[PDB]
Structure formats: structure tokens, C-alpha cells
Amino acid sequence: TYKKPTGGIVTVRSEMGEPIHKIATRGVMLWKEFDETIFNLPKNKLVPTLEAKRDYIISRLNAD
């Protein structure tokens, strides 16, 4: 559950960085995708990454 949705459940980090066991829904799968590609990034890389992705982020948030 750290790598991929195993039997319909998957691990996503909390606000604080604590692992939580959530159903691998589109919403939670978005969450896990953002943990890998956004929330891990350092604060000197975060904001220039968001503005670069702005389109893709808004389409997923609105959709999923």
C-alpha cells in the first residue's frame, strides 16, 4: 500500500507526513500523486512548480 493500490486500499501521507490507510479512490489517488510530485518538493521549488503545472492541477482538482 506504499507503492500502489493493493486490494483497493493505498497509503497517503497526512498534513504532518504521517501514513494513513485510505480507499484508492480518484480523490485519494490524486492525493498520492501530489505527495510524489508536489508536497515533497522544497519551498524554493514548490511555488515555481505549482505556477508551471497550474492548468493540470486545476483540471484534476475540479475533475477528481
Curated annotation (Swiss-Prot):
Q: What else is known?
A: Present with 91800 molecules/cell in log phase SD medium.
Q: Which family does it belong to?
A: Belongs to the fungal fatty acid synthetase subunit beta family.
Q: What is this protein's function per UniProt?
A: Fatty acid synthetase catalyzes the formation of long-chain fatty acids from acetyl-CoA, malonyl-CoA and NADPH. The beta subunit contains domains for: [acyl-carrier-protein] acetyltransferase and malonyltransferase, S-acyl fatty acid synthase thioesterase, enoyl-[acyl-carrier-protein] reductase, and 3-hydroxypalmitoyl-[acyl-carrier-protein] dehydratase.
Q: How does it assemble?
A: [Alpha(6)beta(6)] hexamers of two multifunctional subunits (alpha and beta).
What protein name is recorded for this chain?
Fatty acid synthase subunit beta
Naturally occurring in which organism (per UniProt): Saccharomyces cerevisiae (strain ATCC 204508 / S288c) (Baker's yeast)
Q: Which gene is the coding source of this polypeptide chain?
A: FAS1
Which part of the entire protein is covered?
835 to 898 of 2051
